[PDB]
Design a protein around this ligand. Structure first.
Ligand SMILES: CCOP(=O)(COc1ccc(C[C@H](NC(=O)O[C@H]2CO[C@H]3OCC[C@H]32)[C@H](O)CN(CC(C)C)S(=O)(=O)c2ccc(OC)cc2)cc1)OCC
Lengths: 99, 99
């Protein structure tokens, strides 16, 4: 499909057996999801943007389905205000910018 | 053009007669540029990101050319980690997400 940018590009994702709304974010290197109790091991990490840095938990090889397109990669979990789908997963679903 | 996301979607912009590099950021509502001198009046404003809020200077109806495409809109200037082109201007240049 094609998504215009009049409004926030919010889509439904599926992760860890749960449906959520997430933002398709070409300005995000990595994927950052709201607090959730995913199973398995993780590693502490800090990511920064406007306003400073936040602490997150890095989970690897997590499967996410974005609009029916599957993707496997690293997911950061922490006190983010919004679920953010970053380039590490956007590339896997064939997402491009076009103008 | 069509832009893949294996690398950061960085493009050259021209604002106030000066060339800069900026990030096409579909997760940003607004356009935020690093500290710089712009002519005309400005109003102090605040915007919030992943790590909290920052103080910016709001410039309205500013000419800005993004990868050869002209836009006239709001540009925020402040201590952002990187120049980001947000949806307010991405819509003006006809930018969409596609997968
Ligand atoms: C009132 C303000 O609303 P809020 O609920 C913040 O809600 C957000 C936070 C972050 C994003 C993604 C980034 N957008 C954003 O900051 O937009 C700004 C500018 O326009 C406004 O619209 C949304 C918030 C303004 C951007 O797209 C990606 N960032 C990097 C970029 C700044 C270079 S990031 O989120 O900081 C990031 C993601 C993954 C990473 O992997 C290592 C690193 C960094 C969207 C909405 O309250 C704050 C306390």
């Amino acid at each position: 499909p094609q998504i215009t940018l009049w409004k926030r590009p919010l889509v439904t994702i599926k992760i860890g057996g749960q449906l959520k709304e997430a933002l398709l974010d070409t300005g995000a290197d990595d994927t950052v999801l709201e607090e959730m109790n995913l199973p398995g091991r993780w590693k502490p990490k800090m990511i920064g943007g406007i306003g400073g840095f936040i602490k997150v938990r890095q989970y690897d090889q997590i499967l996410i389905e974005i609009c029916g397109h599957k993707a496997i990669g690293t997911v950061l979990v922490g006190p983010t205000p919004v679920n953010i789908i970053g380039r590490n997963l956007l590339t896997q679903i064939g997402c491009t910018l076009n103008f």
